[model samples]
Target: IRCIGVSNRDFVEGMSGGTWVDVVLEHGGCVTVMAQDKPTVDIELVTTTVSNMAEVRSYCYEASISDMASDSRCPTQGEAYLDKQSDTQYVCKRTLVDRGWGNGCGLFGKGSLVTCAKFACSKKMTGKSIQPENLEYRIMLSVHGSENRAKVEITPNSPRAEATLGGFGSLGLDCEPRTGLDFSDLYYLTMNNKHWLVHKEWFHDIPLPWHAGADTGTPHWNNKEALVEFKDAHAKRQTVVVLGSQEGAVHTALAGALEAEMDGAKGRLSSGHLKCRLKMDKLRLKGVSYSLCTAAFTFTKIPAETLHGTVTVEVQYAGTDGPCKVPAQMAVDMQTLTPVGRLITANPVITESTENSKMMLELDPPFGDSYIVIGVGEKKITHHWHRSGS
Candidate 1:
C-alpha cells in the first residue's frame, strides 16, 4: 500500500492485516503547495524487486515451518539459514511473521496470505527394495508448475494419499515416509517385457518407463499430481515476493545457476537456480534399513519446445545395490527459450533391491540458470533482469 505525503495521524497501527495495497488517496499536509493546484502522486504503492535465484531457495525453506503451524506432522521453524553448495552458488535465510488469529493480537484468521521468509523444505527417502534386480527400474521425478520452471516440488509431496497398485497395466508412485513408515519393497519384472511392471508408483521411487503422467492406462505416477505438488509447495513463496503475476514467479531470489567459467570449477549447480546446500537425509524406510537420497527440487526446466531436449541413458556401476542417479544429458528445445547446461543430474535416483548399480547425471548449464537458458554462468544470469523486466 502506497501512502502520500499525508501523515498517518492516529492511523491506528495493525487495524487491518495483509498487503499494503494502495495508499492512493491522501490529503495534502498543511496545504504546503501555497494553496495551488498540485498533481496527483504517480508513485508505486509498493515497489517489489524480483528474486534472482539465490533468494528463492532461502525463501522456499519457510514452508518447513508454515506446515508445522497448522499440522503437527510438519517440522518446527528454524532460524535464518542459507548456503552455497559450490562456488558460483549461494543460499541465504530470511525472517517470518505469523498470520494467525490468536495471540490476543490484532486480527486476521485462516487462509490469509501470511508473510514467510526462508522457504525451507524437508524431504526424506523412503524406499523398500524387495526381491532382486530382475525388475530394476529407475524412478524419474519431475516437478510441473503453474509456470514452466520445470522445478519439481518434493516438500509438499508428502505421504498423504494411498497409491493403489496390483493390476495388469497399473502403475503409480506410492511411498509414505512421514512418521509411521511400513517399508514394503515391491518390484518384479521379467526380461524382454514390453508391457513391463504395472503399478501406480512415482518415478521418485522407480524410473518411469515414460514421461507424461497424464496417461491413465499407462503404468506411471499421475502427471497432474506432479503439477499440483509444485503449486502447493510454492504457495507461501509466491505471496512473499509477489513477483510471479500468477504463481511460481520466483517469489524470492532462488540461487541462480552456478557456473565454472574456469575449467574444473569445484562443484556446479545441478538446477537452473543457484543452491546453497545439498544433503541426503538418512531415515528409516518402510521399517528397516537406512539410505541417503536427493531430496528437493529434482526437476530441471529447459527450452523443450524450441530447443527440443532428449534423454540418453548410459549405465554406470557404483558397487552398490539400489536405484541411483543415471548419467545423461538433455538436448535443447529452443521454443521454450531455455538452454541446456552441464548440471549434476537434476534427476533423482531410486531403484529396487538388486546388485549395486548407480546412475550419474552431470550439469551442462545454459539449461536452467537465468530467466530462461543461455549457458549457465554468473555474468549471463546477472543480466536476467533484462528478461524478467525488473
Candidate 2:
C-alpha cells in the first residue's frame, strides 16, 4: 500500500531496514586501529543470510540536509560512516561517486585478501542508521577527515541574495558528506547594490534652518539633485554654466550672483531685506580606510543670500608649496540618504575551534557594522583529530 503524508513517510521509513546507523548517546566500545594517524581505513565486506547485506566502515567530518556533521563553536560533534564493498577486488561496488572505491581498492596488500585497520577520532557528527542489502560483520579502520565547513543559519533571504552560517552550505547539495562535497568555509550572498555588509554606506544631510548646513555661496554635492523634483528635472531641464574654479574669482562671481538673487527677492518680500546663513549637517565617508580634515575653510564665512536650492560652498586656496591650487567645495542638501542599518552592532556570540587554525573575514569595515546579519554562524578550518607531527 502506498502512503502519502509527512508522518506516513516517517513511520514507513522508520520501520524499514535503514536502522544500521545509530548514535549510542551513552555507550562505549573499542576496535583495532593504526598508530596515531592513517589516511584511510579498511572494512571487510561481509555477507549475512538473515539480513543479507554488505557493509563497509568509513570516516567523515561533514554535515548536510540529511545530518549535522561537526561544530566547534557550540557543543560540537563529528561522525563517521561504516561502509560495505564488493567481494571482487579492483571493481566498483557503490553507486555514489564518493562512495565507490578509488585507489583504496588496491590499498590492501596484493592478493593478501581483506584485512582490518584502526584509527582515532573525537566528537559526535550526525547521520542516520541505514541497513543496506546483505549484512555481515567486518573490521573497518578510520580514514582521512575532510575539512568541516560551516552550516548557515539563514538570517535573511531574497531571490537575489541569502545569508547563512554554521557549516558548509554554499549549495543545497554542497554539504552532502556521502558524496564527498566541498563548499566554502564562509559566505555572504547578496542580491543588489544594497547590503548591510562589510562596510556601511555613508550618508549626509543639510537643511535651511540655522546651523542646518545651508550652503550660502554655491551648491556643491556629489548628487546634483538632492530632491525628487530635481531628480526628475535632471531628465527635462537644461544644464547651467559650470564653475571652473573655487578661487577669489569664483567667490567674486558668487557675491555678484547672490546680490542679483537679493535684487530678485526684493520683488517678493519687499518689506524685509533678504538675509541667509549656511551651516553643514550630515556629511560622510565610506571605505575600509579613511582620513578627514577641514583646515582650508577654518575661518571662512559663506555668503548668506544665495541660500536657495541645495547650497554649495566653495573655497579656493593656492597650495603654499605645491603646483596647482586645490578646490575645496562643501554643500548642504536633503539628498544625503543612508540605510536604516546605521544602528546594528556586532553579534556578541563567538565561535571558535581548538582543533584547527581558522580565520574570519566575518565582520566588514574591520569592525562589526550597523547590522548583525550572521547572529551565530560557525566558521573554521577543522580536523577530526590532529597529527602530532613527525
Candidate 3:
C-alpha cells in the first residue's frame, strides 16, 4: 500500500513530545522538521546533511547564488555553504541580488564578514576581519605652547583588530626615549621643535617634561622647565622621524621651531627712548658653542608714556670660533621708539676677556630714574640709573 501522507493527529498520538522529526523524501535525501502544537499546512524543508558535508580544504573562488546553485555540492535551493580553506573561511549565503535570489559570498571566521563583489577569494580577503599586511601607519604631532605640552596621534589606514597598547612602541626626542606609547592619542613633555622620533625604550633622562606636574615650570630650554628661554644656538632646524614595521619603514621630515622665547617682549629695547653702544664678546646655547646670538636689553621703572620695544643685536662671527663682533651699529630714537639708523664699523670689538668685553650702552640724555638690565644666555646684571657724567 502506498502511504500518501501522515496525519499530525495520528503522529502526535503515537510519538511522544520533543521527538525528532526526520522526513525521508523520494528524492533520496533526509530533512529535519520541527513539530508544533498548531502546525501550519506549509512545511519548511531543511537539509540535515549540510553540516556534516566534507570541509572544502582547497581554496575556491567566492561563488554567487547562481554559481553555488549550479555546483553539485550545494544542491539545496536556499542553503548556506561553507568553503573552509586553512585559517580563513568563506560563507556563501543565498541572498536576493539584482531582484533575483542568488548566493552572495562573504569572508568570515577571522574578524567580521566582508562581502565579495568582483574579487575572488584568496588568502587575503579584503574584509573588516583582517587588516592588510602593508597597512600604513602615520604619526601626527603638534606642540602646544599655551598648554605647555605636546600631543601625538597615530592613525592607521585600516582598523587594527588585534592592536594592543604594549608591543614595541614609544615616542622619542632625538632618538632618546621620552615615554612609552602606543596607537592613537598620546601626550608627553613639551618640545623645542627639535629632533623627534618613534621607537621603543624607557630612557627619561633628557630633562624634558614627561611626567605630570613637570610642565608646571617654565617652557624654556633653560630655567629647568621655565616658561622662556633662548633658541638652540647649534641646531637651526627641527626634525621628525617615523619608524614602522611596514614597507617604506622610515620617514624623516624637517620643520621650524615650535616654541618661541616666552619673554620676547622683555628683551626688546628699541621701543623705549634710549641710545648707546652695546657689545657682546661670547654667545652660547649651554655655554659650549661660539655661534650667532642676540643681545637682550631690559628696562624697569621707566615712565609709562615712553614707548619701549625689544632691540635684538645680531652678533655674528668673523670665522669659526673666531672673534665675535656686531655686524651693524644700532641707533634708537627714544621718542619715536624706532631705530634711527644702523652704523657699521670695525672699532668697538668684543673680546674673550669678561672684564675687557665691556657691553656698554650709554643713554644720550642719561637715565633720570630707571633700571637697566643686561644679559647673555642665563646670566643677568641689573644696574641702577646713574647720571651721564657719573
Supply the global lDDT for candidate 3: 0.21
Candidate 2, 259-305: lDDT as tens digits: 11111111111111101110111111111221221112111223221
Cand. 2 TM to true fold: 0.10
Candidate 1 Cα outliers beyond 4 Å, as residue runs: 1-290, 293-307, 321-347, 356-364, 367-390
Candidate 1 per-residue C-alpha lDDT over 265-332 given as tens digits, one digit per residue, 9 for 90 to 100: 11111111111111111100122233432221122322222112212122333324344333233334
lDDT of 1 at 148: 12
* Candidate 2 lDDT (Cα, 0 to 1): 0.17
Q: Report the C-alpha lDDT of model 3 over 1-390, residue by residue, as the tens digit.
A: 001121221111102343222222211111112122211111111110101111111111121111111111122233332343111122222222221123222321111121211212221100011112222222221110001122221122232111111211111211111112231221111123111221112112222112222234531112111111222211111111211111111111113211111121111111111011111111101222234323432333231211112122222222232234322222233233333322111122344423223232222123343333333333333344332333
Lowest-sum lDDT 10-residue window in model 1? 30-39
What is the Å distance of residue 306 in model 3 from its true position? 17
**Model 2 RMSD in angstroms:** 43.0
TM agreement with the true structure for every prediction: 0.14, 0.10, 0.16
Q: State each candidate's clash count.
A: 85, 41, 16
- lDDT order, best first, reads 1, 3, 2
